[PDB]
Amino acid sequence: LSYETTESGDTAVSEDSYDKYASQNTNKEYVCDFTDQLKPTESGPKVKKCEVKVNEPLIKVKIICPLKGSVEKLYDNIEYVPKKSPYVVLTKEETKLKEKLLSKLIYGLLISPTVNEKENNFKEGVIEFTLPPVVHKATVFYFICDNSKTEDDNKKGNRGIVEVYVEPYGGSLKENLYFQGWSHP
Amino acid sequence: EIVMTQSPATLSVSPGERATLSCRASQSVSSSLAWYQQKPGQAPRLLIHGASTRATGIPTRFSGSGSGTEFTLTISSLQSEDFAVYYCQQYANWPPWTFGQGTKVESKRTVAAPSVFIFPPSDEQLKSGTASVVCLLNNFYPREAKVQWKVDNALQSGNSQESVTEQDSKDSTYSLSSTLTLSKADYEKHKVYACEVTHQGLSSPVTKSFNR
Amino acid sequence: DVQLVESGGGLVKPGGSLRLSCAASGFTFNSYTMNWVRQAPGKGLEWVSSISTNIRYIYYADSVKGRFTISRDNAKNSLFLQMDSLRAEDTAVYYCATIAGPLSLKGDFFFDSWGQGTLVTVSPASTKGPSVFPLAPSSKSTSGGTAALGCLVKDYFPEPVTVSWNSGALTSGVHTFPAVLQSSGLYSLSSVVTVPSSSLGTQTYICNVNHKPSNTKVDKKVEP
């Protein structure tokens, strides 16, 4: 009866004024921190887009989302999709973000189940995954932290999205005696 | 856009004493705040980043504190260089990075009365029909003063405009000029002109005049 | 020895355009986010534009986007702001500023170093040189052996002027006032100097007014 379900959806408000941001890259750790950036300030929601760009091996990606009731009155209607992040990510096919699995999407990808003694999930605020040494095809996937239904003092929150764009990296098959095969990972 | 309100508007404090300034935010900025110093006619100087981390090359008397909504910048023992306008800036919810409207700290000194001079219009200015009478209030403190113009013992409203100098580095004092500009026909029609000054350094409001 | 030299300011009528530049020296230019911040006369700081070290994340103030264009040249160590379709609100001194590091979603976006700014005046007035009038040191402008003399710098546009007395020989007792604009829409300024009344006749006192927007250099002498 209980089962894993798939879902669709990109936005709930007008767009094309996305306000892109790059991720904060601390030398191998790429971070999208939404703690102060989604608090309700302007009347009406403002979509904010963090952009992670990966063209090198073993990049850790950390995404921080504030919790429901983490601070009083500011996150009473926060939502995060997908719920099983980072095991489930959002991918765009028909301009709708449909739920797909990250281990099918990049082959050989490993997800630690505990980020820092707490569960690797948005229930604990922060998700975190490390990309493998070789990715063979370019891949884009998405996460959403929607505070745009929270309203305090007649001001609505923000819809933050994370776009992880992985370029192909890892080099050619030959002249890589370590990742080639016949004895290897 | 979250507003940064600075308090107070102007802060009068004697050199050597302690000055605390308050920045208040509409929404939490959560330690993403900076303090800048701007002496007049110059570029801003970065003082404190991160709301408690002093910038490099910044005196130790400046200290930052605060969280979320409320912040204080404190200069413990005040020096002559530190008389300036001070701005707080948040960098948490952006765009845009919003600034506060500034807090001017001024050098408190002992009360000084202005030297009041009056200058009649020059005859090169009387070539055109643009006669202007100038009242100078020199080297006074505080800057709160009230000037009024009496032409044949008649008060004027909106026929004159003032300008204050900013506070002098060496003696901590202000100077004000009030220019009354009228036509040459109004200048030659009336005969006596008086500048009436009310100020804290004077017991009674003082009047200085000239005729033709 | 970090240097940020702004250039390109001046007077433009409303609707026109202008291009400000900022030549930088003393640091590795390609690892700094460059910014423009403006200041109206008498008012506070307002950020207008910013460009990251990666020239993809450019940000404008809400009131100026669609009019302003920021650009960067990493080889020449230069920063550019094209200002088109200028309204009257845009009259301000514009400062070039640096932020250490690239521009992320969060963290450490404070202005590390600033330049000396350039003035941009938007007004439909033409450039006019000043009339320079004397303010004679009478015996009714004498307090205690100290007498004041001045020169009134009337009806000029736009700012600035620079006033010096006796080609810079007189520094003590000088108060050149900041300018105020009258109802005409032009500016008037009054520069005064206190002096001992004993030396009034013996030493001549001339004021040198310089209006570089019109290149009008006036030397006027005062006597009772």
Numbering used by the authors:
A (entry chain C): 562 to 746
B (entry chain B): 1 to 95, 95A, 96 to 211
C (entry chain A): 1 to 52, 52A, 53 to 82, 82A, 82B, 82C, 83 to 100, 100A, ...
List passages from the publication reporting this PDB structure.
Pfs230 is essential for Plasmodium falciparum transmission to mosquitoes and is the protein targeted by the most advanced malaria-transmission-blocking vaccine candidate. Pfs230 is a 363 kDa secreted protein containing 14 six-cysteine (6-Cys) domains and is important for gamete adherence to human red blood cells and subsequent oocyst formation. Transmission-reducing activity (TRA) by antibodies elicited in mice has been found to target the N-terminal region of the protein, and the clinical Pfs230-based candidate immunogen contains the first 6-Cys domain of Pfs230 with a segment of its N-terminal pro-domain (referred to as D1M, amino acids 542–736). To elucidate the structural basis of antibody-mediated inhibition across a range of potencies, we determined the crystal structures of six antibodies in complexes with Pfs230 D1.
To elucidate the structural basis of antibodies with potent TRA acquired following natural infection, we solved three crystal structures of antibody-antigen-binding fragments (Fabs) for RUPA-32, -55, and -97 bound to Pfs230 D1+ at resolutions of 2.6, 2.9, and 3.3 Å, respectively. In agreement with the epitope-binning data, all three Fabs bound a common antigenic site on Pfs230 D1+. Indeed, all three Fabs bound nearly identical discontinuous conformational epitopes on Pfs230 D1+, which comprise the following: residues from β strands 1 (amino acids 580–583), 2 (amino acid 585), 3 (amino acids 592–594), and 4 (amino acids 608, 611, and 612); loops 2 (amino acid 584), 4 (amino acids 595, 597, 598, 600–603, and 607), 6 (amino acids 632 and 635), and 12 (amino acids 716 and 719); and the disulfide bridge formed by C593-C611. The three antibodies are marginally distinguished by the inclusion of one or two distinct residues present at the periphery of the core epitope on the antigen surface. The distinguishing residues are S604 and K614, S578 and N586, and K610, for RUPA-32, -55, and -97, respectively. Notably, the largest binding affinity perturbation was observed for RUPA-55 and the E612K mutation, with KD values of 2.4 and 58 nM for the WT and E612K construct, respectively. On Pfs230, E612 interacts with the complementarity-determining region (CDR)-H2 of RUPA-32, -55, and -97 through an H bond mediated by a germline-encoded tyrosine residue at position 56. In addition, a salt bridge is mediated by RUPA-55 CDR-H2 residue R55 and E612 on Pfs230. An electrostatic repulsion introduced by the E612K mutation likely explains why binding by RUPA-55 was more perturbed, compared with RUPA-32 and -97. One point of difference was observed in CDR-H3, where the peak buried surface area (BSA) contributions of RUPA-32 and RUPA-97 occur at position 100 but was offset to position 100a (Kabat numbering) in the RUPA-55 structure (yellow panel).
